[PDB]
């Protein structure tokens, strides 16, 4: 007897990591070390039926990680008071292209100690007077933290197992020949991104495309790669940390010192991989639903900055990248058809977590010149509903609900229970 769907997930993690960094603090507080036994061991026959996209385990891992995020919001992060009005100016003393600025170095009036005293203070805002924040601002900061995803294992309790499709070619709703039962997963890293999977897991054999409803264009298409497309992101923006402890209740930072005039924040994607991978993707598409069609990739359709750009994080700052460079190639149905692609990005401090309960700020980006090298492990796509007279199919970057990213990770785990 195998009964499914039980919100019960054990956890596993730790080696050299402890506290400080918020991910490290979290894994430390919610996980115990693992053991290198796990045997799984598939048993002969025992079914061919499965369906990864109706897994409530995903929704569990999701709501868990978010609640944990609030549990991090509790101690140090400041929901108040200082965002009122900003006396900002610009470093532009001569100009072309009407650049204005995303980053501004500003002056302020700040409650320090005692009653109603102020001192002149530097403030930076990522996006002249006023302007403030809109109806919420939690400021994370904190003395000892950081933000890098840490491997988190999900395990089944006592009297429970987890079946696992080891079939390389799964239709997602369908015929699976090899079922095994593991007690604990290998350890999943919590990468929060859209459009591409960064870090994550690779396909064992070939590139695999997966959709909950290949006809319904509103449903996402998790495209998993057998190979990584490079992406190196260098944001050489510089900020010097100054945390003025002037008052007991108050804990203020001061960023925006020095210089270096770094261009925005910068990134790259490396293309050779992107050439073969995109060709092979249109190959898979044309060997699945797309039989004879020219495949075109336009950029994001529009929306919130988190939706229009590849919004991901390089250690707690929220990067937004113009994504035209990833989606600007028309793939000819007839046949297939040192330079690197350089993508324009921006660092944000003010992000909107949760629902609207509050905004989250990583206030003092420490140091400067911080490059994050990543492996493009993925694509999350939504199809542009087209016609058949166009003799072409258009595909756009979609996403937003990270639960889709977990289905893209938790695709081979379904918690089950055993009965005599």
């Amino acid at each position, epitope marked *: 007897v195998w009964k499914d769907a039980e919100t019960t997930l054990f956890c596993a993690s730790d080696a050299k990591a402890y506290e400080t960094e918020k991910h490290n603090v979290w894994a430390t507080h919610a996980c115990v070390p693992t053991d290198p036994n796990p045997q799984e061991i598939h048993l002969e026959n025992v079914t061919e039926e499965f369906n990864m996209w109706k897994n409530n385990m995903v929704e569990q891992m999701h709501t868990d990680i978010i609640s944990l995020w609030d549990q991090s919001l509790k101690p140090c992060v400041k929901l108040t008071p200082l965002c009122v009005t900003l006396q900002c100016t610009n470093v532009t003393n001569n100009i072309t292209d009407d650049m204005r600025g995303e980053l501004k170095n500003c002056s302020f009036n700040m409650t320090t100690e005692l009653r109603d005293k102020k001192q002149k203070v530097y403030s930076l805002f990522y996006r002249y007077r006023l302007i403030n924040c809109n109806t919420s601002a939690i400021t994370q900061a904190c003395p000892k933290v950081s933000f890098e995803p840490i491997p988190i294992h999900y395990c089944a309790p006592a009297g429970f197992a987890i079946l696992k499709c080891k079939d390389k070619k799964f239709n997602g709703t369908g015929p699976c020949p090899s079922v095994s039962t593991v007690q604990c997963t290998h350890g999943i890293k919590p990468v929060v991104s859209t459009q591409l999977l960064l870090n994550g897991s690779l396909a064992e054999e070939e590139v695999m495309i997966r959709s909950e409803n290949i006809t319904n264009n509103a449903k996402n298409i998790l495209v998993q790669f057998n190979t990584p497309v490079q992406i190196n992101c*260098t944001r*050489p923006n510089n900020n010097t940390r100054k945390s003025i402890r002037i008052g007991p209740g108050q804990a203020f930072y001061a960023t925006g010192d020095i210089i*270096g*005039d*770094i*261009r*925005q924040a*910068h990134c790259n994607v490396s293309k050779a991989t992107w050439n073969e991978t995109l060709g092979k993707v249109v190959k898979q598409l044309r060997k699945h639903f797309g039989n004879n069609t020219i495949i075109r990739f336009a950029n994001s359709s529009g929306g919130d900055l988190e939706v229009t750009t590849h919004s991901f994080n390089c250690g707690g700052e929220f990067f937004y990248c113009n994504t035209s460079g990833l989606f600007n190639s028309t793939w000819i149905s007839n046949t297939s058809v*040192n*330079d690197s692609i*350089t993508l*324009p990005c921006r660092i944000k401090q003010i992000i909107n977590m949760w629902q609207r309960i509050g905004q989250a700020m990583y206030a003092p980006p420490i140091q400067g010149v911080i490059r994050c090298v990543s492996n493009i492990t993925g694509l999350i796509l939504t199809r542009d509903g087209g016609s058949t007279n166009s003799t072409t199919e258009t595909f756009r970057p979609g996403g937003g609900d990270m639960r889709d990213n977990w289905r893209s990770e938790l695709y081979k785990y379904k918690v089950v229970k055993i009965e005599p």
Partner: antibody
Amino acid sequence: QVHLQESGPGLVKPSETLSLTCNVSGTLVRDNYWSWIRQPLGKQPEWIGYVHDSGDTNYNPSLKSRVHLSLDKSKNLVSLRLTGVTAADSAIYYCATTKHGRRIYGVVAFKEWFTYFYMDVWGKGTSVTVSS
Amino acid sequence: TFVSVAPGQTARITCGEESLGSRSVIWYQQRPGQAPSLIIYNNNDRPSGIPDRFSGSPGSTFGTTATLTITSVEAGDEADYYCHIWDSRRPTNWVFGEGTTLIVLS
């Protein structure tokens, strides 16, 4: 192997038009930038211009009004014409396969980004003498 | 100009104006009776068939001249050498730098 062979008249009278051909094997002309370069006797090379099927084409300003570069995809060759020649145009002329590179820095240094070209496969060259 | 050196020793060749902006210098080697042939691109990158005896000076310190260094020189290195300078503050150079003749005193 990519292989270029230039041909021309060897001798041209002053005021006449010099016409040169570069026969290409081992690659298709549409898939490369092509550069004509010239080098007088006892002197350093003097380039001529670069041409691409895309239209990304440019001529040495000093020769601007007298020079024409072309690609012939059907015959897989590259051509040059230079009008109103004088003795100053006497040189060995070379056809080349021209690769493109970029110097890329941080965005803070965007004004200093630039492209450069290098000639990686040269023909054997054709000799041109203009005199009366 | 001219540069002479004994076999096994190191030769150095200077070419072009002092740098003004950021640089990409291309070096070519031309043997007697032959077409020019290359040596280096992107200041210190070599194409297929060129050994690491040949090295170019970085497109770096402002107000300096590009230099090609050849270590462990052999008689086969005897040739004319030319540079083609790309400098971010200068016009495209349509003429190569003045050449230098390397003499190997065998």
